Symmetry: C4
Subunit: 103 residues, 4 copies
């Protein structure tokens, strides 16, 4: 991997760490909410997966008394990580010059 590519890879790993925290706060961010739906720790992790990828299909979601920000904060983490990889995108075309002479 390239220097810039390594940075993007590092950012991806950071997102995974957040999911672990999301899976937890998710259990508590429901146990005691009006109309709750996200219960159980084994299933709470799965919900965490479908959200950090900026894809809120639905399935399960936090209420209000459970700091709705629980999901918002987790999702935002993904935006920054997937947004940083840009440093590796703006260089995607730049290589065209190297490809010209095969540098």
């Amino acid at each position: 991997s390239a220097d810039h590519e390594r940075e993007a890879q590092k950012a991806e790993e950071e997102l995974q760490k957040v999911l672990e925290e999301a899976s937890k706060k998710a259990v508590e961010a429901e146990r005691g909410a009006p109309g709750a739906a996200l219960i159980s720790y084994p299933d709470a992790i799965w919900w965490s997966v479908e959200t950090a990828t900026t894809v809120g299909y639905g399935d399960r979601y936090p209420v209000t008394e459970e700091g709705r920000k629980v999901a918002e904060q987790v999702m935002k983490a993904g935006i920054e990580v997937f947004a940083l990889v840009t440093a590796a995108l703006a260089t995607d075309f730049v290589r065209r010059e190297e490809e010209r002479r095969g540098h």
Copy 2:
């Protein structure tokens, strides 16, 4: 500290302003709309937060009488904000050149 970083932070503040304004109109927009499902100022901001992210997740959703344009404005506002910050991400790759010099 830099000059593009501050501009990016300012854009984030603008998004929050819209959400606050969205909550006001959002509630009023619903008042009179069928199947609104969205009412009350205290929960108006809650639905507004997911709207800016365009994620929506699956909490609520406006109707047609509430001038759907109400969401379109908020959803579009969020997308533009998370895009302008590119001014600080488009320079991420450029830093590689500065590192080469070591100054």
Copy 3:
């Protein structure tokens, strides 16, 4: 104004064109297909809005007969338009170079 702003602005108008065509085909694509729930002409236009800017909260759900491609194509068109302006977004930081010299 920058030649990128005017170019990006033009792209926005192109997105609206698809919605107009989508508002129609959507009625027919849904009017006559099984499991359809779109129908209605004044309601079809409203659906053809938030869908373009992704979101997925079109407030509806097309089946298969309605040539899902009806919505798929609409959503994709938004990505191209929203992704095209990316050019104007890049030149964002580039302006910093001029700030250094104050030119």
Copy 4:
């Protein structure tokens, strides 16, 4: 014919291949899971198509035994290919230099 378009266009081709392979897994993955909703085979690709566009819309949703990773894999696959196109797009502002000269 702009090498950037060839690379970007090529990425889209790989996206279609994933949907075909993923579609067969989605239906199979959904089978055997509790509360399965995606039991369709011919329409399995249809759901996969919207999945690659990272939207979900609101047609169907994977369970937990369907190795949610199945749906998650398609979403990431779409982001990579589309995100890569950022190359030709990021190079959009660069062309300004040629336009500035007039040839």
